[PDB]
Amino acid sequence: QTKPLPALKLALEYIVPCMNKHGICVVDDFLGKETGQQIGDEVRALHDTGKFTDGQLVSQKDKITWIEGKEPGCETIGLLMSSMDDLIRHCNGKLGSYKINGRTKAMVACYPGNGTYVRHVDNPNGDGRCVTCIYYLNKDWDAKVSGGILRIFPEGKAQFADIEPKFDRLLFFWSDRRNPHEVQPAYATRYAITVWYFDADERARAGEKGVRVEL
Ligand SMILES: N#Cc1ccc(-c2cccc3ncnn23)cc1
Ligand SMILES: [Fe+2]
């Protein structure tokens, strides 16, 4: 007896108030089992064929790739991105005073899970990114056995959030200092896709994390 929520309804009746109140918003069953397993297979195919780069080489002074959405074998990742963009479009105007004029490409990541991430802020220095969006791909993830919980500590609140990296879960949170977060050790392989959305004013006033594409 079940139906998908129209994006406008999901954005305005849930995402906007959740974000404005808590700065964090979880949406389960975002795309359904079929589209989600297709994304998983595409992500796993990229990994098996050796298209990922060591993530420690990116950050220094996990394994990742950046997906635009139109590449061969990434069609459904492109659809995920379109569906995310639609939600943000229906929100835009009402997520704080942000006006979102773009986003990064999709960061597709494999986290091997062998006791691997410390508390950090995604955007500490006003790099322009205002909303972090993560989509998880781990079928039948059991956190008791496997770990890998994202813990978020909203700043100046007497509460925190424990987000399992669950299949077909879409997560939004403010990328700035409001949401320091850590990832507890994991003991199985994980896949996720992260996109960051840009506020126009902060972006204009400021690698691949600094590349704004249109929605
Ligand atoms: N599944 C899964 C999965 C695991 C770890 C992270 C990860 C790594 C490093 C920093 C960071 N910040 C927020 N998530 N996250 C993201 C997704
Ligand atoms: Fe993070």
Nearest CA to ligand 1 atom 9: 117
Of the candidates 46, 190, 53, 194, the residue with the CA atom closest to the CA atom of residue 113: 190
Nearest CA to ligand 1 atom 17: 192
Please give the single-letter amino acid code of residue 140: D
Mutating to test ligand 1, I would choose from 122, 132, 134 the residue with most ligand atoms within 8 A of its C-beta, which is: 134
- Cβ 192 under 6 angstroms from ligand 1: yes
| CA 104/CA 205 separation, integer angstroms | 17
CA of 173 to the centre of ligand 2 (A): 10
CA torsion sign, 153 to 157 to 158 to 161?
Answer: negative
Find out whether 15 and 92 touch, Cβ atoms under 8 Å: no
Is 22 labelled a binding residue? no
Please give the single-letter amino acid code of residue 52: F
11 DSSP 8-state letter: I
Helical H runs in the chain?
A: 7-10, 16-22, 32-48, 56-59, 75-91, 143-146, 200-205
- Strand-pair partners of 110: 63, 191
- Cβ 107 under 6 angstroms from ligand 1: no
Find out whether 80 and 37 touch, Cβ atoms under 8 Å: no
CA of 153 to the centre of ligand 2 (A): 12
Q: In what order do the strands lie in the sheet with 161-163?
A: 161-163, 150-152, 181-183
Name the CA dihedral angle for 82, 86, 89, 94, rounded to a multiple of 10 degrees.
Answer: -130
CA of 3 to the centre of ligand 2 (A): 32
> What is the resolution of the experimental data for this entry, in Å?
2.2
| CA 4/CA 190 separation, integer angstroms | 26
Query: What tokens does 1 get?
Result: 């007896």
- Strand-pair partners of 63: 54, 110
Set out the domains of the chain in order of their start, with CATH numbers: 1-215 (2.60.120.620)
Which residues in the chain belong to E strands, given as ranges? 24-27, 53-54, 63-67, 100-103, 106-111, 129-136, 150-152, 161-163, 170-174, 181-183, 190-199
| CA 51/CA 32 separation, integer angstroms | 26
188 DSSP 8-state letter: S
- Cβ 36 under 6 angstroms from ligand 1: no
Query: What tokens does 51 get?
Result: 């298209």
Burial code (b: 16+ CB inside 10 Å, e: under 16) for 54-77 equals ebeeeeeebbbbebebeeeebebb
Residue 136's φ and ψ, nearest 5 degrees, are: -100, 150
Please give the single-letter amino acid code of residue 212: R
Find out whether 178 and 152 touch, Cβ atoms under 8 Å: no
CA of 8 to the centre of ligand 2 (A): 27
| CA 125/CA 209 separation, integer angstroms | 13
